[PDB]
CSV table of C-alpha atoms and ligand atoms in Angstrom, one decimal:
chain,number,residue,atom,x,y,z
A,18,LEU,CA,103.4,108.6,129.5
A,19,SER,CA,107.0,108.6,128.5
A,20,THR,CA,108.6,111.6,126.7
A,21,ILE,CA,111.2,109.2,125.2
A,22,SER,CA,108.9,106.4,124.3
A,23,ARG,CA,106.6,108.8,122.5
A,24,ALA,CA,109.4,110.4,120.6
A,25,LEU,CA,111.0,107.0,119.6
A,26,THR,CA,107.7,105.5,118.4
A,27,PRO,CA,107.6,104.7,114.6
A,28,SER,CA,105.1,106.6,112.5
A,29,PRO,CA,102.4,104.2,111.1
A,30,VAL,CA,104.2,104.6,107.7
A,31,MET,CA,107.5,103.4,109.2
A,32,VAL,CA,105.6,100.4,110.7
A,33,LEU,CA,104.0,99.6,107.3
A,34,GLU,CA,107.6,99.5,105.8
A,35,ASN,CA,108.7,97.2,108.6
A,36,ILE,CA,105.8,94.7,108.3
A,37,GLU,CA,105.6,94.6,104.6
A,38,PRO,CA,106.0,90.9,103.5
A,39,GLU,CA,109.1,89.8,101.6
A,40,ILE,CA,108.5,88.9,98.0
A,41,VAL,CA,107.1,85.4,97.6
A,42,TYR,CA,108.0,82.9,94.9
A,43,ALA,CA,105.6,80.9,92.8
A,44,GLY,CA,107.5,77.7,92.4
A,45,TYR,CA,106.9,77.9,88.7
A,46,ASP,CA,108.0,74.8,86.8
A,47,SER,CA,109.6,76.0,83.6
A,48,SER,CA,109.8,72.5,82.1
A,49,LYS,CA,106.0,72.2,81.8
A,50,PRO,CA,104.1,73.6,78.8
A,51,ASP,CA,102.7,77.1,79.0
A,52,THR,CA,99.0,76.4,78.6
A,53,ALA,CA,96.1,78.0,80.3
A,54,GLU,CA,95.6,75.0,82.7
A,55,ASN,CA,99.2,75.1,83.9
A,56,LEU,CA,99.6,78.9,84.1
A,57,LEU,CA,96.3,79.4,86.0
A,58,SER,CA,97.0,76.6,88.5
A,59,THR,CA,100.4,77.9,89.0
A,60,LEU,CA,99.0,81.4,89.5
A,61,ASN,CA,96.5,80.0,92.1
A,62,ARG,CA,99.3,78.2,93.8
A,63,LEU,CA,101.2,81.5,94.0
A,64,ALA,CA,98.1,83.3,95.3
A,65,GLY,CA,97.9,80.8,98.1
A,66,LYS,CA,101.5,81.3,99.3
A,67,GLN,CA,100.9,85.1,99.1
A,68,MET,CA,97.7,85.1,101.1
A,69,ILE,CA,99.5,83.2,103.9
A,70,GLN,CA,101.9,86.1,104.1
A,71,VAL,CA,99.2,88.7,103.8
A,72,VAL,CA,97.4,87.2,106.9
A,73,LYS,CA,100.6,87.5,109.0
A,74,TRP,CA,101.0,91.0,107.7
A,75,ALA,CA,97.4,92.0,108.7
A,76,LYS,CA,97.9,90.4,112.1
A,77,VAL,CA,100.5,93.0,113.0
A,78,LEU,CA,98.9,95.8,111.1
A,79,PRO,CA,98.3,98.9,113.3
A,80,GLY,CA,94.6,99.3,114.2
A,81,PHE,CA,93.6,96.0,112.4
A,82,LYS,CA,94.4,93.7,115.3
A,83,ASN,CA,92.1,95.9,117.5
A,84,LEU,CA,89.1,94.6,115.4
A,85,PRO,CA,86.9,91.7,116.3
A,86,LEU,CA,88.5,88.5,115.0
A,87,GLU,CA,85.3,88.1,112.9
A,88,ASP,CA,85.7,91.4,111.1
A,89,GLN,CA,89.4,90.8,110.3
A,90,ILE,CA,88.6,87.5,108.6
A,91,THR,CA,85.8,89.1,106.7
A,92,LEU,CA,87.9,92.1,105.5
A,93,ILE,CA,90.6,89.8,104.3
A,94,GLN,CA,88.3,87.5,102.4
A,95,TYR,CA,86.6,90.4,100.7
A,96,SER,CA,89.8,92.2,99.7
A,97,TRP,CA,92.2,89.4,98.9
A,98,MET,CA,91.9,89.9,95.1
A,99,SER,CA,92.2,93.7,95.5
A,100,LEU,CA,95.4,93.4,97.5
A,101,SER,CA,96.8,90.8,95.0
A,102,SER,CA,96.5,92.7,91.8
A,103,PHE,CA,97.5,96.0,93.5
A,104,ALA,CA,100.7,94.3,94.8
A,105,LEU,CA,101.1,92.8,91.4
A,106,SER,CA,101.0,96.2,89.9
A,107,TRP,CA,103.4,97.5,92.4
A,108,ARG,CA,106.1,94.9,91.8
A,109,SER,CA,105.7,95.3,88.1
A,110,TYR,CA,106.3,99.0,88.5
A,111,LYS,CA,109.3,98.7,90.8
A,112,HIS,CA,111.2,95.7,89.5
A,113,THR,CA,110.2,96.0,85.8
A,114,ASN,CA,109.3,99.7,85.3
A,115,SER,CA,105.9,98.5,84.3
A,116,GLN,CA,107.3,96.5,81.3
A,117,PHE,CA,106.1,93.2,82.5
A,118,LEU,CA,103.5,91.7,85.0
A,119,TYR,CA,105.8,90.6,87.9
A,120,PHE,CA,103.7,88.1,89.7
A,121,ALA,CA,106.9,86.7,91.3
A,122,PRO,CA,110.6,86.6,90.7
A,123,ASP,CA,110.4,83.2,89.1
A,124,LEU,CA,107.2,84.0,87.3
A,125,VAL,CA,107.2,87.2,85.1
A,126,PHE,CA,104.6,87.6,82.3
A,127,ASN,CA,105.2,89.1,78.9
A,128,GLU,CA,102.4,89.7,76.3
A,129,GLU,CA,102.9,86.0,75.3
A,130,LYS,CA,102.2,84.5,78.8
A,131,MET,CA,99.3,86.9,79.1
A,132,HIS,CA,97.8,85.4,75.9
A,133,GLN,CA,98.5,81.8,77.1
A,134,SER,CA,97.0,82.4,80.5
A,135,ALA,CA,93.5,82.7,78.8
A,136,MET,CA,92.9,85.9,80.9
A,137,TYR,CA,94.7,88.4,78.6
A,138,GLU,CA,92.3,91.2,79.1
A,139,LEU,CA,92.4,90.9,82.9
A,140,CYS,CA,96.2,91.1,82.6
A,141,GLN,CA,96.0,94.3,80.5
A,142,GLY,CA,93.8,95.8,83.2
A,143,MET,CA,96.3,95.0,86.0
A,144,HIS,CA,99.1,96.1,83.8
A,145,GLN,CA,97.2,99.4,83.1
A,146,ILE,CA,97.5,100.1,86.9
A,147,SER,CA,101.3,99.7,86.7
A,148,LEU,CA,101.4,102.1,83.8
A,149,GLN,CA,99.6,104.6,86.0
A,150,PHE,CA,102.1,104.0,88.8
A,151,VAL,CA,104.7,105.2,86.3
A,152,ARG,CA,102.8,108.2,85.2
A,153,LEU,CA,102.2,109.2,88.8
A,154,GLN,CA,105.7,108.1,90.0
A,155,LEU,CA,103.9,106.5,93.0
A,156,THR,CA,106.2,106.1,96.1
A,157,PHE,CA,106.5,103.1,98.4
A,158,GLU,CA,105.0,105.2,101.2
A,159,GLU,CA,101.9,106.0,99.2
A,160,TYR,CA,101.7,102.4,98.1
A,161,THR,CA,101.7,100.9,101.5
A,162,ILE,CA,99.1,103.2,102.8
A,163,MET,CA,96.9,102.6,99.7
A,164,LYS,CA,97.3,98.9,100.1
A,165,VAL,CA,96.0,99.3,103.7
A,166,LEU,CA,93.1,101.3,102.4
A,167,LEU,CA,92.2,98.5,99.9
A,168,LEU,CA,92.1,96.0,102.9
A,169,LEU,CA,89.2,98.3,104.1
A,170,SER,CA,87.6,98.8,100.7
A,171,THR,CA,84.8,96.1,100.9
A,172,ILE,CA,82.6,95.5,103.9
A,173,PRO,CA,79.4,93.6,104.6
A,174,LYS,CA,76.3,95.4,103.2
A,175,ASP,CA,74.9,95.5,106.8
A,176,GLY,CA,78.3,96.1,108.3
A,177,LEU,CA,81.0,94.7,110.5
A,178,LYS,CA,80.6,93.8,114.2
A,179,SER,CA,82.6,96.9,115.2
A,180,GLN,CA,81.4,99.3,112.5
A,181,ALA,CA,82.4,102.3,114.6
A,182,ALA,CA,86.1,101.1,115.1
A,183,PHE,CA,86.5,100.2,111.5
A,184,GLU,CA,85.4,103.5,110.1
A,185,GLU,CA,87.9,104.9,112.7
A,186,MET,CA,91.0,103.1,111.5
A,187,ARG,CA,89.9,103.7,107.9
A,188,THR,CA,89.6,107.5,108.3
A,189,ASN,CA,92.9,107.5,110.1
A,190,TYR,CA,94.6,105.7,107.2
A,191,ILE,CA,93.0,108.1,104.7
A,192,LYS,CA,94.4,111.0,106.8
A,193,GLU,CA,97.8,109.2,106.6
A,194,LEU,CA,97.6,109.4,102.9
A,195,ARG,CA,96.7,113.1,102.9
A,196,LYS,CA,99.9,113.8,104.9
A,197,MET,CA,102.0,111.7,102.6
A,198,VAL,CA,100.9,113.5,99.4
A,199,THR,CA,101.5,116.8,101.2
A,200,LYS,CA,105.1,116.1,101.7
A,205,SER,CA,99.7,122.1,99.4
A,206,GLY,CA,98.9,123.3,95.8
A,207,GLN,CA,99.6,120.0,94.0
A,208,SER,CA,98.9,118.1,97.2
A,209,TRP,CA,95.1,118.2,96.7
A,210,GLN,CA,95.4,117.1,93.0
A,211,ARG,CA,97.7,114.2,94.0
A,212,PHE,CA,95.3,113.0,96.8
A,213,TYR,CA,92.4,113.0,94.4
A,214,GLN,CA,94.4,111.1,91.8
A,215,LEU,CA,95.2,108.4,94.3
A,216,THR,CA,91.7,108.1,95.7
A,217,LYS,CA,90.4,108.0,92.1
A,218,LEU,CA,92.9,105.2,91.4
A,219,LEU,CA,91.7,103.3,94.5
A,220,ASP,CA,88.1,103.5,93.3
A,221,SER,CA,89.0,102.2,89.9
A,222,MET,CA,90.3,99.0,91.6
A,223,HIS,CA,86.7,97.9,92.3
A,224,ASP,CA,85.7,97.5,88.6
A,225,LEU,CA,88.9,95.8,88.0
A,226,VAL,CA,88.6,93.4,90.9
A,227,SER,CA,85.0,92.8,90.0
A,228,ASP,CA,86.0,91.4,86.6
A,229,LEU,CA,88.9,89.5,88.2
A,230,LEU,CA,86.6,87.8,90.6
A,231,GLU,CA,84.0,87.0,87.9
A,232,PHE,CA,86.7,85.0,86.1
A,233,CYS,CA,87.9,83.6,89.4
A,234,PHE,CA,84.4,82.4,90.4
A,235,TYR,CA,83.9,81.0,86.9
A,236,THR,CA,87.1,79.0,86.9
A,237,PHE,CA,86.4,77.9,90.4
A,238,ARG,CA,83.0,76.5,89.5
A,239,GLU,CA,84.3,74.8,86.4
A,240,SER,CA,87.6,73.8,87.9
A,241,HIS,CA,87.2,70.2,86.9
A,242,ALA,CA,86.3,70.7,83.3
A,243,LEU,CA,89.1,73.4,82.9
A,244,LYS,CA,91.5,71.4,84.9
A,245,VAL,CA,92.4,74.5,86.9
A,246,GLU,CA,93.8,73.7,90.4
A,247,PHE,CA,93.4,75.6,93.5
A,248,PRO,CA,95.3,75.4,96.8
A,249,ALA,CA,93.4,74.8,100.1
A,250,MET,CA,94.0,78.4,101.0
A,251,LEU,CA,92.0,79.6,98.0
A,252,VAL,CA,89.4,76.9,98.2
A,253,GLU,CA,88.8,78.1,101.7
A,254,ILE,CA,88.6,81.8,100.7
A,255,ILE,CA,86.5,81.5,97.5
A,256,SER,CA,84.2,78.8,99.0
A,257,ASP,CA,82.9,81.3,101.5
A,258,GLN,CA,83.5,84.5,99.5
A,259,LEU,CA,81.7,83.5,96.3
A,260,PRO,CA,78.2,83.1,97.8
A,261,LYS,CA,78.5,86.3,99.9
A,262,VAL,CA,79.5,88.2,96.8
A,263,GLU,CA,76.9,86.8,94.5
A,264,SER,CA,74.3,87.2,97.2
A,265,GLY,CA,75.0,91.0,97.1
A,266,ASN,CA,76.3,90.8,100.7
A,267,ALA,CA,79.6,92.6,99.8
A,268,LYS,CA,79.5,96.5,99.8
A,269,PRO,CA,82.2,98.4,98.0
A,270,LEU,CA,83.3,101.6,99.6
A,271,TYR,CA,84.2,104.6,97.2
A,272,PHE,CA,85.7,108.0,97.5
A,273,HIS,CA,83.8,109.4,94.5
A,274,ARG,CA,81.1,108.5,92.0
B,1,LIG,C1,92.6,84.1,90.7
B,1,LIG,C2,93.4,84.3,89.3
B,1,LIG,C3,94.9,83.6,89.6
B,1,LIG,C4,95.7,84.2,90.7
B,1,LIG,C5,96.0,85.7,90.4
B,1,LIG,C6,94.7,86.5,90.1
B,1,LIG,C7,95.1,88.0,89.7
B,1,LIG,C8,96.0,88.8,90.8
B,1,LIG,C9,97.2,87.9,91.4
B,1,LIG,C10,98.3,88.5,91.6
B,1,LIG,C11,99.5,87.7,92.1
B,1,LIG,O1,100.6,88.3,92.2
B,1,LIG,C12,99.4,86.2,92.5
B,1,LIG,C13,98.2,85.6,91.9
B,1,LIG,C14,96.9,86.4,91.7
B,1,LIG,C15,96.0,86.3,93.0
B,1,LIG,C16,93.9,85.8,88.9
B,1,LIG,C17,92.5,86.4,88.5
B,1,LIG,C18,91.7,85.2,87.9
B,1,LIG,C19,92.7,84.0,88.0
B,1,LIG,C20,91.9,82.6,88.1
B,1,LIG,O2,90.7,82.5,88.4
B,1,LIG,C21,92.6,81.2,87.8
B,1,LIG,O3,91.7,80.1,88.0
């Protein structure tokens, strides 16, 4: 054990900041008409590019790499939607002050786009999270920890290969959050507000997935395109979810 090495080691929070992926661009073609077909296909394309960066992020995520390859794949598949809309809400909060849905720098949604996307209510749900970020003045530190917790929010009804190791890393990250919001009195209130917001993601993600699975099934009739990345994810996720094999983890309720 090195006295120096231990003192110079980055806190998990600092590591989260270092590994956070750079903002990804959607490659949105502004010359094409803003119809549901084009906007949804474009969002799905963006989703793909983002998931590729998410996997690289999870690969170097403290504690995550120590999980069986099998569990890592499962966790990612189960949570990809949760991480997507949560990151969406964050960028919207930071770069727009929650005035718009900042899917990407080249793709910012206003009320109009929301209507044209044919998923207006789902957009309102995600936007409502951003509004909360404003009311709470959420910090980037709290954000990164919470995003990690979401990665570990849905598991197999029966469990992962290394259930013990998983509950460990999870509990450690929860503790990391407690420490953040403490930097008590208003600390306990803060922590509960954040865990309560994390739980609320499940009903939101449930509705987002329902529409995702629907548009996936009717992809041809709707003319909605999906990148191989998402085809790969949804193909395997959809049946597990509809089979009741996905188990949501809550803090309350
Ligand atoms: C999957 C989805 C398109 C892709 C988006 C997702 C909502 C969250 C999200 C946030 C992003 O920053 C990139 C795209 C994305 C992952 C939508 C919910 C339903 C919609 C469709 O099902 C289109 O067919």
